[model samples]
Every structure is written in structure tokens, then in C-alpha cells.
Target: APADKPQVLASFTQTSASSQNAWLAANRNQSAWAAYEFDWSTDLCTQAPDNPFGFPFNTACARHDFGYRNYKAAGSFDANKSRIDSAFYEDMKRVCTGYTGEKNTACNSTAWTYYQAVKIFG
Candidate 1:
């Protein structure tokens, strides 16, 4: 919740397909962002594939990393856990839909299990 990161972080995940592409098009390169000084606590996606089913759940995971790190930073992890999980799933679904309907089914189901597992464990 500091400076541009809160919005920048939301811009990365909480919006629609168009905005996701905006973050991409804006050239917010991950490596460059490393120097921008965001938390990198993805000790993250534990007991999970960063990309299940060869889909790109990894991108959603970036947001998940922040969900935990940011809420934990705010001492609100307990309350926000569900919020983060929902956010992760929405971000996940967006990634789940970038191709043929067949891939969508596979990716969504993969995301489904990946999600609830984290919901329970996280």
C-alpha cells in the first residue's frame, strides 16, 4: 500500500484482459522491476507448480506473492487470505482463457485445484 506499487500491483492482476496487456505493453519488465524494490517473497507457490498443465499460472503467482507479502506486511493475512485467494483465482482464470476453448477447460480445471489447495494451505 505504498506509493505506486499498490496500484501498480493491482494493475498487474486485478483488472481485465486489456489492462493486463497494458502492464505488458508498458514494458514493466520483471527484471527491471526487481530494482523497483517490491517484495520478492514467493517462497511462494509452495508444493505447487508455478505453471500447472504447462499453462502460465506463474503470472497469477506473481500476484499471489504480493497478496501474501502485502497482507502480511499489513498484518492482515488472516482476513485477506480469502481475498487474495479470490484475486489469485480471477487472475488465474484470465490466464486460463488465452487460447482455444479446449485449453481453457484444461487450464481452468488445473487452476481450480491449484487454487483450492492454496486456499486451504495458505
Candidate 2:
């Protein structure tokens, strides 16, 4: 039988602390796990107002930041820069698409600024 939602929720709490800790630590180690586990609650765009375009710093951008930093730390950023830049541009454009008129223009500009910065620096 399939477990109920409440049953699954209750089972989560029963997991051993050591196991939970292991999972948390393992998730952050990119080499150990090739998956990105980002906290969606962070508002990095709003936290840092330096974004040229008025695009809100939301979960997607935050995830990109996380991946960028992690890969750089692992010394693989340069090798992956092309793919990373491509993905970032697409994500930024997607965000800009949500806006209209002058707001969209500003977002696109900001997105380009960020994209170029990463290309040159990362």
C-alpha cells in the first residue's frame, strides 16, 4: 500500500540524526553528488541591490549563484564556463520575460551585465 502523506511526514522525523547529517553534508559536496540542493527561500537579488536591472533576486538566480560558487570552489568553473554562461543567460532572459516595457529593458540590461561579468571573471 502507498504511504499516506501524514505517514511520510511522520517518518521523516524518525530518521536518525547521523543519517540526516550525512545526507546534508553529502548534498553540499558536488563531487559526492552531482546534484544542486539550493534553499529556495533565499532572496539574493533583493538582499544585494547591485543588480543593474530591477529584476528581483529570486530562487532561480540564487540557485545559479550556488552552482557557480560551488563549481568555482571545485576548480571546474573555467572548464564549464561556456555551459554555465549559456544556462545563466537563458535563466536571466526567462526572468526578464516576466516583465514588460521599460522594466523588461532594465532587466535585460542587468542580465547582460551579470552575464558579461561572469564570462570575464569566472
Candidate 3:
């Protein structure tokens, strides 16, 4: 929710695919977070300062990191498997397709969408 981000994204929402592409071609280098759907709290992989390895110390702790325990349950993680696959991952593939760095590659790679991450580690 930076000041300029809304202005840029609002412009994209009003345009055709080609227009959107033109905007993206000019702005893609700003930062991945500048793209439309990346959520720092959710999509990006992060580790707490105390646990830099990104591994959970316990089931309860991992549940905290992932935001919940399972699907359709109370206190379950907010990012469900289907949502991760459909919204966040798909958006990454579509908008940031040209990115070749480790995070981009990881996000674009078929092996590591949000659903895959949960299935493997949840």
C-alpha cells in the first residue's frame, strides 16, 4: 500500500493486456513487491531472526509461521492450498514471468507454488 503503488496498479486495471504489458515493461525493475499481487506477509518466504533457517521448532510453531494447521478448520492458515495455487502463484507466473533470480525461479517453478509448499511442510 505504498502511495505510488496504487496509482500504478490502478492504471493497469483500466487497460488492455498490451497496455498492461507496456506498463510492466517499463516498471518491472522497480522490485518484485511492486508487481500486483505479491504479499509480504504471505507469498514471500521469510524466516524470523531467531530462526534464520526457516525451519519450525515445533508443530505449534510451524502452525504459527504458516498461519494455520489445515483447511476449513478454526485457526487454520489463511492461505489455503487452492488459493495459493490459483491466485498468488498464478499471478507470479503471469506478471513476473521474466524474472530469473532464485525467488522468481522458485515461484515460477512448477515444484514450489504455495500449495506445494504447504503440502511438503504443513
Candidate 4:
């Protein structure tokens, strides 16, 4: 955690969203953190059961887990809960786009349920 500790600590030290937005907005042009690489030790979904909501394996679920874990670790997740939920909903809906009929309906429902659960409990 030593190498990542600085980034985690630095993330929370900021007191203003405007400064954060400015820094992030500026970085978008040059991409300063583009070279940073995260070393993932385990399979994204293997550490936990895949059917937590009775939905089959999906990349959106793995992505949601990644966001949740990293943001929670950095101590900013609660502050950014709405943003996280929005991202999760968008990603899940993107995944739902590929399906049709009842399968699509079920997928959308599961995604909504997952989002609601996190929003209400987290």
C-alpha cells in the first residue's frame, strides 16, 4: 500500500470541488496520470460469487466492483455516492442494451436493484 498510499492520501486532502475539477479538467488535456498502472492481484469477479443478484456474469458488474472498492479505499466514496451510482446505472444500462425481450427487462431490473442497494446501504 506504500506506493498507492500517497495517491490515496492526496485525494482526500483537497477541500474544494472546484479545485478538484480544475485539476481533473486540466489533466484531461495532457493526461498526467496516464502512465500509472494498477496491478490487480485477483480476477475481477472470482473473489466473490457472480450471482449476487441472480444475474449472470457481466463486465458491468466487475467494473462496478472496481469503482466501489477503489473509491471506498480512498475514503471518497461516500462523498461521491451519487456519481458512483450514476456511473453504475449507465454502465449497467449499456450492458442491458445488448439484450431484448424479457432478458433485457430482467437485466435492467437487476441493475436497478444493485444500484438501489448500494445507494441505500452504502
The numbered model that scores best in lDDT is 1
Candidate that beats the other on TM-score, 1 or 3, i.e. the better one: 1
Which model, 2 or 3, shows the larger TM-score? 2
Residue by residue across 1-122, what tens digits does model 2's lDDT show? Answer: 13353332222222244333343354455364333332223344553336744475353355455445645654666775566555556666767888999898888888787767667765
How would the candidate models be sorted by lDDT, starting from the highest? 1, 4, 2, 3
How high a TM-score does candidate 4 get?
0.52
Query: What alpha-carbon RMSD in Å does predicted model 3 have with respect to the real structure?
Result: 11.9
Tell me the spans in candidate 3 whose CA falls farther than 4 Å from its real position: 1-43, 47-80, 99-107, 110-115
Residue lDDT tens for model 3, 43-92: 23343223322322232122222223223232333445443233323333
Provide the lDDT at 46 for model 4.
Answer: 48
Task: Name the candidate, 1 or 3, with the larger lDDT value.
Answer: 1
Best by TM-score: 1
Model 4 alpha-carbon drift over 4 Å, by segment:
1-57
Q: RMSD per prediction, one decimal?
A: 4.0, 12.6, 11.9, 8.2
lDDT of 1 by residue, 85-106 (tens): 7777877788766877788898
Give candidate 3's whole-model lDDT: 0.37
| Weakest lDDT window of 10 consecutive positions for candidate 4 | 36-45
Cα error, candidate 1, residue 73 (Å): 1.8
Summarize candidate 4's per-residue lDDT along 12-119 as a digit string, tens digits. Answer: 234334323433353344344444432222244344333444555344444455446556666677776666556656666666777899888987887777667667
Worst 10 residues of 3 by lDDT: 55-64
